[PDB]
Amino acid sequence: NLKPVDAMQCFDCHTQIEDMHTVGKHATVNCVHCHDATEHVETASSRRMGERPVTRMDLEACATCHTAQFNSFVEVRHESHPRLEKATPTSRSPMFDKLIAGHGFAFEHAEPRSHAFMLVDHFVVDRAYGGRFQFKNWQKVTDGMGAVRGAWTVLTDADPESSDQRRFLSQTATAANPVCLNCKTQDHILDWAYMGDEHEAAKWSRTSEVVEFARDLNHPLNCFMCHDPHSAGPRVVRDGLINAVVDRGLGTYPHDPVKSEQQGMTKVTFQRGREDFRAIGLLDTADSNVMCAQCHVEYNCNPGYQLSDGSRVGMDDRRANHFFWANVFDYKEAAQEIDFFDFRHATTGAALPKLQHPEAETFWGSVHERNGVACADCHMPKVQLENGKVYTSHSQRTPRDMMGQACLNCHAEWTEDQALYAIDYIKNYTHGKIVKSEYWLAKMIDLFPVAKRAGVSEDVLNQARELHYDAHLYWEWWTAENSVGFHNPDQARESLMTSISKSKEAVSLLNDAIDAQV
Amino acid sequence: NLKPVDAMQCFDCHTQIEDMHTVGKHATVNCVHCHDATEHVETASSRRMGERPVTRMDLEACATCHTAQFNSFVEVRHESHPRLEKATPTSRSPMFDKLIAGHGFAFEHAEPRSHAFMLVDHFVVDRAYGGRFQFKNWQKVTDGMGAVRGAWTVLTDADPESSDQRRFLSQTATAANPVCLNCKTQDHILDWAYMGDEHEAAKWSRTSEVVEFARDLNHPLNCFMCHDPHSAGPRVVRDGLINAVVDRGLGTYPHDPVKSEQQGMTKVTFQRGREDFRAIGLLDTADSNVMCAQCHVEYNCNPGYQLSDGSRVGMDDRRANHFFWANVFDYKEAAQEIDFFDFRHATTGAALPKLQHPEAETFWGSVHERNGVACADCHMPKVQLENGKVYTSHSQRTPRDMMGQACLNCHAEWTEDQALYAIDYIKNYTHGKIVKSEYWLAKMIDLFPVAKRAGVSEDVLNQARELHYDAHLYWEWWTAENSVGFHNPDQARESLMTSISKSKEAVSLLNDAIDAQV
Numbered sequence A, B: 001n002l003k004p005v006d007a008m009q010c011f012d013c014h015t016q017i018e019d020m021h022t023v024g025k026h027a028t029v030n031c032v033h034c035h036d037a038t039e040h041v042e043t044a045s046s047r048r049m050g051e052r053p054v055t056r057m058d059l060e061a062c063a064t065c066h067t068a069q070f071n072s073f074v075e076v077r078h079e080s081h082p083r084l085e086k087a088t089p090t091s092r093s094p095m096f097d098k099l100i101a102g103h104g105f106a107f108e109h110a111e112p113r114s115h116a117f118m119l120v121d122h123f124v125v126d127r128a129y130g131g132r133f134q135f136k137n138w139q140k141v142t143d144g145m146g147a148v149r150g151a152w153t154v155l156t157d158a159d160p161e162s163s164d165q166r167r168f169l170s171q172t173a174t175a176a177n178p179v180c181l182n183c184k185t186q187d188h189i190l191d192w193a194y195m196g197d198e199h200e201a202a203k204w205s206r207t208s209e210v211v212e213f214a215r216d217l218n219h220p221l222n223c224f225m226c227h228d229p230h231s232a233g234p235r236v237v238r239d240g241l242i243n244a245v246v247d248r249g250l251g252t253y254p255h256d257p258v259k260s261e262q263q264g265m266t267k268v269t270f271q272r273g274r275e276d277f278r279a280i281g282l283l284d285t286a287d288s289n290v291m292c293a294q295c296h297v298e299y300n301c302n303p304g305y306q307l308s309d310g311s312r313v314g315m316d317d318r319r320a321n322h323f324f325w326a327n328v329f330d331y332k333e334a335a336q337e338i339d340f341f342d343f344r345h346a347t348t349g350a351a352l353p354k355l356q357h358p359e360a361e362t363f364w365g366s367v368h369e370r371n372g373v374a375c376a377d378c379h380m381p382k383v384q385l386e387n388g389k390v391y392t393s394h395s396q397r398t399p400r401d402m403m404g405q406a407c408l409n410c411h412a413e414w415t416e417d418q419a420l421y422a423i424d425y426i427k428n429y430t431h432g433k434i435v436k437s438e439y440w441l442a443k444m445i446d447l448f449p450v451a452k453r454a455g456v457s458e459d460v461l462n463q464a465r466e467l468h469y470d471a472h473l474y475w476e477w478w479t480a481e482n483s484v485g486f487h488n489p490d491q492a493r494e495s496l497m498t499s500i501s502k503s504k505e506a507v508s509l510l511n512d513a514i515d516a517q518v
């Protein structure tokens, strides 16, 4: 059985913790629930850690007092199809292989599934670790609670004796790097300096051997990513988000300075040896838009190249961990701002961006966002009980499973079927424009080999490559973004029509140039 | 195909109809929809009918232009169990045979079923016509549309060559009389003088041979019972109701003079020659409480006896067609006012009232009635359509079949299961008190033979008989009333506790008197 410790003894040194813990709703929660610090207390000084205390990062540390929220979080949505490749005719991007050629996502890019699986899915996807990590067997794919208990309870490593990234299976890639893990787990929260910069107190950084880092990590989406364990108050912990909002002064709502002030973020820094080490962002309100934006954003978490001279930008560079914090129509400028692109297209040679799941930046300026609606209202609503204590559902999933709470309490004029119909109108329309955008991208791409072999000039090919950047950006935003336009239907429409326009321009350019060589 | 007539010519002699028809929502509906007056127009003067025009009473006269209301009305609710005798342990009155002994309802008293069957059910019930009328075969009991097309399309008469009331089956009664038919049909609306008084212009009256009258009647619950066919406005046609509300000055809401004035009734009389003949009551508002009270009331529609001297009150007497228009606690006074009782109990010899379905008089003063709710809100609600023209459902049935529209639009705090649970709490409690009331009534009744045979005095027996009147009234109101307390739970509770108190007093009186003789 747990035996409480004297928190006043800790507070003698830990004044920041005192200030947070004594005031919030965890003022009665003893440190022993999450820390084993006996040897630490025997050896520490006011400025030197001494023996390092044990800190629990497992989600079951919160589940004995918050079982309802834990059990809701760990539920597996079986209707969220697992390991479903997006580059197929029945998924999100039928022509993805042709369009993404040259990028690691060509090796595998599946649709997302329930949050319990995020860390194991990261470890086992074919693009990440060369096939090094696999489920122990094909039964384990069902085991959401097991994944939550720990990744290494359900996975194997093909070679525990080596730590290099290499291919164990032929059609895999080794794109994983330490930055990725920040959106899968925060088990490393005490072992990683802010931004992954080199730091004498950090075991891990942007330049670490990612296979070694992986082996030290266990739990997905820790409860403390959104809730400070000491104050119980709302927060974020993701460095790239704090960097955008606070360090670069862009605010929580870059398009709305008033909402940014009302729903702001305060950066709190913790030190090692009286040097800044790590940071958190305390929120003014329990604002899920910003909580979810720790991960559901467009980012850099990877090496790339400079737009200016084509030189390599490695993991050592700050730009390898970057939140652009820009909507689709501001993105090209944001990428120019840091002089960065992701890959050269394998067929066209164009410098291209790689977009990823920009839900937060897409939601900005939408009708729902402008009306004060937030991610949680549609994706983790309050539970409705005939008789009971209300709590917030932590099963983050499509509103289709809980339409009464997610939509119909606000939209009293609609039945469930009417609300579903409105979602599908947008998704069907948007998907049609995604498909047409891909058709035109593909038509352009297929002209590049013909143009090159016919002797079309480098100047014309470069003009077409410049068009390819924009045609790509204004399409791929929407295959990356998970709502198929629902989050901002007018923006999707405008973007996708722009993509098509750019590809059509490039097709005309290249056809005319080819025809002139004949 | 129908050919329109020149209505202006009719109006030269029918100013009363002109003033209604030209102003209301049937101003464009030609008379040929409901009248065949060709030979009438050829032979009439303004002071001489000439040949009698034909008037359609069938509901299909309205269904041509109002199919949705007609089809909703004629629907059969199969879940409303048919021919289900109330004097059984699993229905409303487990001890009914003992308690009602001496009255015709002992022969058969079934629960109500859908409105389509009202006229056929009246004709075929074992207590009504000595078993003379039967369904043609046992298949016809399902045929609601056929019954509406006409009773004699689905029934047979055991002896078309005779018109006397007599028993054709051994355990039947011949309680039917012409007053009954006024709550089953209004096919006779032009052939029956106000109250069924004798009149030169009336084919039928209170004193008619009911078997002959029955053969002239076809359709249940005519659409024009609630809607004037000329103005389309709200009305009642039932003489007994107009007599209580208007002639006797009691008002539409006897307990609320303000509501009576706002939601009142105007008596309109129609003449034959110089003499008043029939009447209707035009309503100030479309008030279902008053529409439904044409039938869902306690009434006399039968011969009886005088409380003063025990003499017979026959069908010729106006008291044989009477709406008491009194709540349960005013009823005994109302029956004393007309010096009337129904039957002498077969075992106790007590003069007793017979109560029938007093829904209107029970609903008065209830929380719902005081809040301006009316029968239609729970039993005939507006249809809710995702896309469509709203109409009023005419399928008058339990709210359990349409809880969203009947209850939950007002009670937003409840789920369907919660609302059902609240109904059942009241019905379960009320039924327990009905059962306990019957237990005590039965205990008293069973002491009468013992007391009589022991030589208990007539004075003591008469004391106990006076107690029996009250014990009976305060019980039977609630087996008669169809809501099992829901329409007025506090009144049911007070009444049933009074019944039990009266029976207990009588049991003590009789036991002590028997014990004293021994």
Ligand code: HEC
Pocket: A005, A006, A007, A009, A010, A011, A012, A013, A014, A031, A035, A037, A038, A040, A041, A044, A045, A046, A047, A048, A049, A052, A053, A055, A190, A271, A272, A273, A274
């Ligand atoms: C003064 C002698 C201390 C006492 C008493 C306690 N702690 Fe401590 N702790 C101390 C230092 C100098 C540091 C390094 C950071 C700093 O503020 O300079 C720490 C660090 C921790 C940590 C972080 C460990 C990690 O892995 O990074 C934890 C979780 C921690 N301390 C907890 C803790 C508890 C629960 C105490 C009461 C039992 C406690 N500390 C006392 C110095 C001192």
Ligand code: HEC
Pocket: A007, A010, A011, A014, A017, A021, A029, A030, A031, A032, A033, A034, A035, A055, A056, A057, A061, A062, A189, A190, A224, A229, A230, A270, A271, A278, A280
């Ligand atoms: C779980 C419900 C916790 C309770 C109770 C306490 N702490 Fe904690 N602590 C917890 C976690 C998950 C972490 C990791 C960092 C984060 O922000 O989530 C920590 C960290 C600390 C630290 C380190 C701060 C730093 O310099 O980086 C300290 C010094 C610390 N915790 C102290 C501490 C004290 C004294 C507590 C009892 C009053 C206490 N914690 C409770 C989780 C939980």
Ligand code: HEC
Pocket: A025, A026, A029, A030, A033, A061, A062, A063, A064, A065, A066, A223, A224, A227, A229, A231, A232, A233
């Ligand atoms: C029991 C010993 C607890 C442990 C372990 C954890 N929490 Fe807790 N929490 C506890 C209490 C008694 C309360 C207050 C309840 C109330 O409403 O009065 C809380 C509250 C929270 C909250 C709400 C905070 C707020 O609204 O300001 C959150 C978000 C919360 N707790 C989160 C949480 C986390 C993430 C935990 C594991 C790190 C955790 N709690 C552990 C009791 C206990």
Ligand code: HEC
Pocket: A108, A109, A110, A111, A112, A113, A121, A122, A125, A127, A128, A175, A176, A177, A179, A180, A181, A182, A183, A294, A295, A296, A297, A298, A299, A300, A301, A302, A356, A357, A480, A482
């Ligand atoms: C936060 C800014 C992220 C970083 C850094 C990385 N990932 Fe991610 N990933 C993130 C989200 C919000 C989602 C769900 C939404 C979606 O569009 O899928 C994902 C999903 C994955 C998946 C599952 C789906 C799939 O593509 O097969 C995997 C396998 C995955 N992520 C791997 C991964 C790798 C290898 C990363 C570094 C190169 C990486 N992620 C970083 C958020 C974030």
Ligand code: HEC
Pocket: A137, A138, A139
């Ligand atoms: C008993 C007669 C079985 C039947 C019927 C089914 N399965 Fe099975 N399965 C069985 C065993 C003994 C094992 C191996 C257990 C171990 O851990 O050693 C399995 C394995 C699987 C797996 C994993 C396959 C892999 O290559 O790792 C899966 C996905 C699986 N079983 C699914 C499954 C399905 C869906 C079944 C019905 C169609 C089915 N099994 C039947 C034993 C038996």
Ligand code: HEC
Pocket: A059, A062, A063, A066, A069, A070, A073, A221, A222, A223, A224, A225, A226, A227, A286, A287, A288, A291, A292, A376, A390, A391, A392, A393, A394
């Ligand atoms: C960010 C993605 C979250 C993660 C990770 C966890 N929770 Fe959470 N929690 C989140 C939100 C948006 C809210 C609602 C805030 C609001 O006021 O609208 C909550 C709330 C809680 C609470 C408070 C009580 C309640 O409303 O249910 C508790 C106790 C809580 N959360 C606990 C908790 C646990 C145990 C988690 C890991 C299993 C967890 N939260 C993760 C957002 C996020």
Ligand code: HEC
Pocket: A080, A288, A289, A292, A293, A296, A359, A360, A363, A368, A373, A374, A375, A376, A377, A378, A379, A397, A398, A399, A400, A423, A427, A482, A483, A486, A487
């Ligand atoms: C209601 C007004 C919403 C708000 C606020 C947010 N989202 Fe949403 N999201 C919504 C719908 C109707 C859909 C389509 C769901 C469907 O089943 O068709 C989505 C989709 C997503 C997804 C993908 C879900 C899945 O396909 O399984 C994700 C990952 C998602 N949304 C994330 C998300 C974020 C992070 C939000 C705040 C920035 C956000 N959503 C808000 C409706 C609504």
Ligand code: HEC
Pocket: B005, B006, B007, B009, B010, B011, B012, B013, B014, B031, B035, B037, B040, B041, B044, B045, B046, B047, B048, B049, B052, B053, B054, B055, B190, B271, B272, B273, B274
């Ligand atoms: C004057 C020359 C008349 C004309 C033109 C029409 N009607 Fe008539 N109608 C007239 C009289 C004198 C009476 C009898 C009044 C009385 O004292 O009893 C009637 C009666 C009717 C009736 C009721 C018949 C019944 O069953 O009692 C109806 C339905 C009726 N009349 C209809 C009607 C129509 C539709 C006419 C135009 C086609 C019409 N009448 C003309 C005198 C006259």
Ligand code: HEC
Pocket: B007, B010, B011, B014, B017, B021, B026, B029, B030, B031, B032, B033, B034, B035, B055, B056, B057, B061, B189, B190, B224, B229, B230, B270, B271, B278, B280
């Ligand atoms: C059906 C939609 C009708 C239309 C159109 C007209 N009439 Fe009618 N009328 C109808 C009914 C069912 C009855 C029976 C009585 C009742 O109140 O329901 C009548 C009655 C008459 C009478 C008799 C009035 C009386 O003195 O008792 C008359 C004189 C009469 N109707 C005339 C009449 C005229 C002239 C019409 C065309 C303008 C007309 N009716 C239309 C049903 C319907």
Ligand code: HEC
Pocket: B025, B026, B029, B030, B033, B061, B062, B063, B064, B065, B066, B223, B224, B227, B228, B229, B231, B232, B233
């Ligand atoms: C078509 C030739 C009709 C026949 C036959 C009947 N009705 Fe009618 N009715 C008709 C019309 C064009 C309207 C007006 C529609 C509108 O809203 O503009 C009506 C109206 C009614 C009403 C509503 C009256 C009101 O709200 O004031 C009722 C209650 C009604 N009609 C009843 C009714 C009856 C009982 C009929 C048979 C005797 C009947 N109608 C026939 C058209 C036609």
Ligand code: HEC
Pocket: B108, B109, B110, B111, B112, B113, B121, B122, B125, B127, B128, B175, B176, B177, B179, B180, B181, B182, B183, B294, B295, B296, B297, B298, B299, B300, B301, B302, B356, B357, B480, B482
């Ligand atoms: C209006 C004041 C009525 C009079 C006059 C008569 N009845 Fe009736 N009856 C009426 C209603 C509102 C109901 C339904 C509610 C209920 O408690 O049943 C009924 C029902 C019947 C039934 C069906 C149920 C049954 O008792 O088996 C029959 C067979 C019946 N009524 C016959 C009947 C007789 C023979 C009447 C004259 C002696 C008579 N009714 C008059 C309303 C009215």
Ligand code: HEC
Pocket: B137, B138, B139
């Ligand atoms: C064909 C092999 C039949 C089977 C199977 C069922 N029924 Fe029948 N039924 C059948 C006939 C030829 C008749 C007589 C038709 C006529 O009008 O002459 C009937 C009659 C009935 C009746 C009426 C009985 C009466 O005495 O009037 C009923 C209520 C009835 N049938 C119901 C019924 C049920 C519910 C059946 C399944 C259990 C059933 N029948 C089967 C022919 C056949």
Ligand code: HEC
Pocket: B059, B062, B063, B066, B069, B070, B073, B221, B222, B223, B224, B225, B226, B227, B286, B287, B288, B291, B292, B376, B380, B390, B391, B392, B393, B394
């Ligand atoms: C009294 C017991 C009624 C009988 C008999 C018929 N109807 Fe009716 N009707 C009734 C009510 C209480 C209402 C609603 C009044 C309100 O405003 O709340 C209606 C309404 C109509 C209407 C108007 C349009 C609508 O609201 O649907 C029509 C056209 C109508 N009723 C037609 C109609 C028919 C054709 C009938 C015989 C099948 C019939 N009504 C009988 C009450 C009563």
Ligand code: HEC
Pocket: B080, B288, B289, B292, B293, B296, B359, B360, B363, B368, B373, B374, B375, B376, B377, B378, B379, B397, B398, B399, B400, B423, B427, B482, B483, B486, B487
């Ligand atoms: C809602 C507040 C109601 C009002 C207004 C009226 N009634 Fe009602 N009634 C109501 C309930 C909940 C019930 C019980 C139904 C059940 O399924 O348990 C009833 C019952 C009846 C019945 C019997 C129905 C059946 O058992 O099939 C009748 C004949 C009835 N009610 C008639 C009626 C009258 C005429 C009303 C106006 C005076 C009236 N009800 C109003 C709910 C409500």
Ligand SMILES: [C-]#N
Pocket: A356
């Ligand atoms: C992940 N991207």
Ligand SMILES: [C-]#N
Pocket: B356
């Ligand atoms: C009928 N009573």
